[PDB]
Amino acid sequence: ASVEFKAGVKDYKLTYYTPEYETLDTDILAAFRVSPQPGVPPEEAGAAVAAESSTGTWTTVWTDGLTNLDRYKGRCYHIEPVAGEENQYICYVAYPLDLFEEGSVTNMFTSIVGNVFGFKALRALRLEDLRIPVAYVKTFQGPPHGIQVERDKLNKYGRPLLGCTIKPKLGLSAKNYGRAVYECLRGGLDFTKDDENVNSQPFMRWRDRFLFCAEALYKAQAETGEIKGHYLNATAGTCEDMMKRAVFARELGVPIVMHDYLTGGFTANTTLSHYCRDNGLLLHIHRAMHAVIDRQKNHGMHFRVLAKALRLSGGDHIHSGTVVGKLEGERDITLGFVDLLRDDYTEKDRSRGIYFTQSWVSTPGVLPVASGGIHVWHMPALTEIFGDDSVLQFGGGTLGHPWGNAPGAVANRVALEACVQARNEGRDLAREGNTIIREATKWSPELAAACEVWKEIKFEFPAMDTV
Amino acid sequence: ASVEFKAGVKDYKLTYYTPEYETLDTDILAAFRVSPQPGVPPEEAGAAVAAESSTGTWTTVWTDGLTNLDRYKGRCYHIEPVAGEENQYICYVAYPLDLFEEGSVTNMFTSIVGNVFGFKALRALRLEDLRIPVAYVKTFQGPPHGIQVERDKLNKYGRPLLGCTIKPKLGLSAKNYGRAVYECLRGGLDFTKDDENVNSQPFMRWRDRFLFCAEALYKAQAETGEIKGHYLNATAGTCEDMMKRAVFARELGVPIVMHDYLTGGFTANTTLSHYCRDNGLLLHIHRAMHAVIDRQKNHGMHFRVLAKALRLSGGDHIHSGTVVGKLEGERDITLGFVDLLRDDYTEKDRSRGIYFTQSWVSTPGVLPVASGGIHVWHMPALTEIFGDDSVLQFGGGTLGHPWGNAPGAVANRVALEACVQARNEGRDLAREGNTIIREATKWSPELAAACEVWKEIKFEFPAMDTV
Amino acid sequence: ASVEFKAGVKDYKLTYYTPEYETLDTDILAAFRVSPQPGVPPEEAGAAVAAESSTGTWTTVWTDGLTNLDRYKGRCYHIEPVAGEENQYICYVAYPLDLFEEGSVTNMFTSIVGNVFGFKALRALRLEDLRIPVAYVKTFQGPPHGIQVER
Amino acid sequence: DKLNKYGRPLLGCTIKPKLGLSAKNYGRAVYECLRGGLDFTKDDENVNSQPFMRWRDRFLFCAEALYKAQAETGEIKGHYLNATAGTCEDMMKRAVFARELGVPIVMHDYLTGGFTANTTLSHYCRDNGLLLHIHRAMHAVIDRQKNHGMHFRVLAKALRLSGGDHIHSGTVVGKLEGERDITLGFVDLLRDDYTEKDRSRGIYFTQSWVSTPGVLPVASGGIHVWHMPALTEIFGDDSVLQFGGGTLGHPWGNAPGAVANRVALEACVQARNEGRDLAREGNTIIREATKWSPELAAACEVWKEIKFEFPAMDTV
Amino acid sequence: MQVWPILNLKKYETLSYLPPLTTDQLARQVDYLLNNKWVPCLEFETDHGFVYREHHNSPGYYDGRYWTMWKLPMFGCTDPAQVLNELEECKKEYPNAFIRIIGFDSNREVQCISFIAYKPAGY
Amino acid sequence: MQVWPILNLKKYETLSYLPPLTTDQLARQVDYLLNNKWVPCLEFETDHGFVYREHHNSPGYYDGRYWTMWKLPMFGCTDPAQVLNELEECKKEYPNAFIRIIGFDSNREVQCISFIAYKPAGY
């Protein structure tokens, strides 16, 4: 069992490249896109990434003999050349289950992406996908409530839900924030929300905002007869402050709070998810700062990973991009991480970005949220890409309307219900979408007015991370 | 006076590009490397970044008329083209102080970095530098203890502090983990380290490790008669668990604990840093995941931005790079941000990466920590690059010695002290470093052993992020 | 650069009267109406107020060599006489920001206004106006709601 | 009784410079002062928690220092750790850590802190066996002038009620203003159960304290060894004498500066016990002690002709 | 500049920083005690000369403040020589004990005088 | 492989693992102190040369970090010789005490040098 100790710097491939190994079902699997520095073999790169993300250091250490390293070491088991790219390979790594702390997305990322991405030996590194074994999935509580309970709690079925980000992003007063929310919700929107950067500020403190948003929300619910929600941001510099905001919302009896899980952190997000499940509070998750990490193909961490991390940490909603909007989202890749958020099982599909087959052992679905630079002409396409289980959020789309918010909300709700109606009668939203919007302008002046303003507005640019 | 609401999209540059603007001293200033997509004017790109990070959105909203937007809007006050580049620009954005929540690095990043990097109109976006005004600096607590109080609490003056990181990274039992710490600490190393990925796991549970590491550090301290620490990892999945580990280390009377602030998140780190201030505990910060954000010139955030944030959030130590080790390190870039962490005032130095002058109104300093692929031969260079106020960490270097840990510690202690003597006596470390190492081998049996094992080891790969 | 320690009383004005000084925006400024006792020069009284409000005592202490007193000393930067008055002057004192505890009006008053008003060499002392720096303002929560939120 | 110190006034120091010291240099200074024979050291009234020194670090370093000095002297030592703060919560956190340290004495500034926080702290010190030293900072804004304000005897009676084991009383002979007959009056109000009305001493009413404990008067502010016979004779043995500049300004250092003040005071106590009059023999008693004590002999040479004589703003 | 000694410089509260007391000086203090109508008592400790904290760390708590009483407090003692004679008696029975003289005021119920009358060898 | 000794291997922080200092080496150190413009000071301890914990177990608390100060930090000293004679005076008075030379930075108020300069016999 025991081999001598020789002090020395060995190639990582001597211990950490194992092309024969068969991946255990308990292993966490990783797909890294590895771009080695010129003159580093691909096998050494794979092994280095597996070793310093698991149990390895630059020179041989005598303590290695005290443990059974073969049981605990990360393994580069498949190397695949990326066609069209020299010195780029997709390196598959497996990690034994015992390496991970139960219920800690924090811990999982710390091992897998903590130090390896800065090694001199690699020009670039990107984590494209992870296979998380069901036995680790069962250690996380997951979404506090999830898709089924939230439709049941709100009594909302048969359509994508509708949201609106209050604008200007910053600088509104608490009272004007509430008068904004009321008019948006009285026009047929289901949800309004604080902007991601609206926390507590010298122009608007949070307890004032929460208090005003509560009144407006409830006034809107009485007039409409339809349940209403306003995401109240609990994001803060400390967890004490995060809880203080969550506690007051519970006292207010509001349905939903929001968090920015990357800028607030996975540690605090997991704290908040557990309070939400404990107090029946919905958690809407803003993905602020993901694009620093995931915009580029050569380096970083794709949103699929961070989106799975969120399902484990916990959120009832997560922004997913719009495809058609101002922010970058490629349809085929977005469709893949949408099914990763929403469904129990997703088989591997390289055409949609999915490198591994992932199962969630009944971890509830997360409701994908499309926000940013979308207007009533985008509604047919949005209904088609995301299906009924989504939330469609129009910020500029509601408040930019010429007659006001309440007319702007009617335009978006009307646009949506006409799309749902036509889809349900069998029409092709892709081909017929504009005909359906135009039809509905004949009996809705609110929609007619929204359509004249945005008729030419498109977002069409070359992408930076396609498959 | 007021201007009529006119619904429709307008160019961002019309309100958010302000070359005439003179920056207020209270404004947060941001230096962005901006790569527009084709067909986008540099001025429109810079004004788009400033808009959607502060108050703007894609279409004109009536509610702008309720506030005084000119007072709260983020502004692009300068555009400077990058050398040797076409369609890449350096855009300076100034954010008013009111936009920001006091005491929250979370909020600051949510606004400045939250959605801009995802915009379809930008090929790439990188945040190179942030100028935090002194009035915002005062709102944060900063390092719990800082450089002066930490040296005073440990009674250690006149040299860099020395540490080793226990290896293998994962897989060691708690008893064996402790046995390693004592052997390392008795040889003269000031600190031992929990690995960043070591939280609580099936192979080693955190409380057992905390307890055993405590016994080992005290026994080593009694033998040595020199104060000793071992950084215990409070990084966890929830804040409750993070705190639980921090309280136990307080029960044990040990001096130092650690956090991975990026994977734990800023919210949790600020909370921990506030706990350490209140209970006398030193807080060591590991920068895991930074390379996912900061490796590439074209896209991301520079580490100088993240290092600043940790000084504001709170930490007594922060990993700084080695320049000479396995992970990427650029001497001139590193030398700039080691000063930003260490001193009260830093003049803008474009050669050293500093885009703005930054003042810390007596915010305590952070001890820079050098770790990763460094051996005794690296000791003269390290001592010169970082100076007395640093911590050197030799995990592989200590546990890779052929005679063991206690000898492997003596080698690094003898190396540094011999380097320190030379600098005191007027020898130039860069020129004579090897000759100083070579004299020490003649009188030191342990240091000699170390020197032959690693004489030929050097990391010399071309760097991906140059000024 | 150190200076030798010499025990014994020295005049306040040598260390704490600085007509040349230019106030930083971080400094707390205070406008004191000063009435010195007979035979006390205005410069000595203004410098005595600064010294005993910030970093000074009656005699020289050795511990001053460990710190940088110039970075921490309060300074009388200006003295203007009062109209219609004799041996009454308006003394302007600048206190560095580091002297003060964040968010504590108690600390602000204990330094600026704590002991100076009882000094024998002074017939009377009034504090007329405080220039609180914005960096110190930011450390305070301020009104719980304020005028707008109240309406 | 708790400190086992009888038969003489207690000796204190105020660490100097007032602001700017690090926590560790605060503690070296505390240890050197305490080992020379001083009973108490103290945080200056403005020293709370600051960018140059945070309180918890101060509390810890000062705790190790007073224990080092107490171990080598054989005498109980105390350092007044300042509890004054911006909020009652911060005030409590400070008083709570002092208790964990098992130290004997904490301090508050009750006029800048306010009466509500001071009565809260007074109640905590009784609950936890902590002595409370009260600094009267900002009083002179109220009580210097005869025409307007409150006299300090009103504020002194208020502190005895609010609660304090020490209150600064003035030196009479020091740099701050105090008239000997007035100071003698409110000192009696601070220490005894009963004071008859004495218009000559500013006592307008007969006051009874119904067995409320007395407060120890504290004399501080521009005093040195030559002032010692006069302080001992004015205030009696139930007092605390505090030499900041007197200890830290000594040319040999703090430990010698402590020994000067402790030697001087005990030479006065012996002479008084032998029957000599401190007002009349004060210079000869200090001078005779300088022949055997070099530390006393050095300090005298430095503070020989240093006096504080000025018209008073408030006389009877 | 003379450095204050750090070793064996144990102190004994009031008058211990003064030169050692002559028998006439000790009598003077006892007379100051008697003239003030304070009750004289004698107190001796062998085991622990100086203060310590063995049993507790609580604020205000120290060990070794209490000493053993010699005989009883001499109420109604009008004669200084009794205190002196009692000292020599305490000394002869307890030569290796520190001994100190304490003065009791009934009205304030506090000791008004305490000074070390005798120190054993090595002290 | 050589086993590091267990016993009587107490150490003295910076330069202690280095071989023992020649008078020339000590002088070069104080020359490094003075040329950086730090202020030299000298510290002695007899009873507790190594750190211990007696009075508290709180984080960051230890005893024996504080040593006694020999005279006063030599402010205004440009002469290494004056520092060196000062070490000699300390030794003659305290032969059984450990003695160390330290250096103060006023700008940062942190000691910038600490090294043992004399040890009692057996050490």
Ligand SMILES: O=C(O)[C@@](O)(COP(=O)(O)O)[C@H](O)[C@H](O)COP(=O)(O)O
């Ligand atoms: O802050 C904003 O700009 C938004 O409120 C959209 O504003 P409008 O609705 O007014 O355009 C969303 O947060 C962005 O879509 C971020 O989207 P995501 O993270 O999903 O990409």
Ligand SMILES: O=C(O)[C@@](O)(COP(=O)(O)O)[C@H](O)[C@H](O)COP(=O)(O)O
């Ligand atoms: O796990 C590691 O690799 C280390 O413990 C060093 O290993 P060795 O001590 O065995 O070399 C450090 O945490 C890395 O330097 C982190 O990188 P960075 O400094 O960029 O944060």
Ligand SMILES: O=C(O)[C@@](O)(COP(=O)(O)O)[C@H](O)[C@H](O)COP(=O)(O)O
């Ligand atoms: O700040 C000061 O000056 C002191 O620390 C004394 O310093 P020195 O010992 O160096 O003079 C005391 O607070 C005053 O004596 C208080 O005055 P009062 O008793 O009138 O309230």
Ligand SMILES: [Mn+2]
């Ligand atoms: Mn938003």
Ligand SMILES: [Mn+2]
């Ligand atoms: Mn590590």
Ligand SMILES: [Mn+2]
């Ligand atoms: Mn004071």
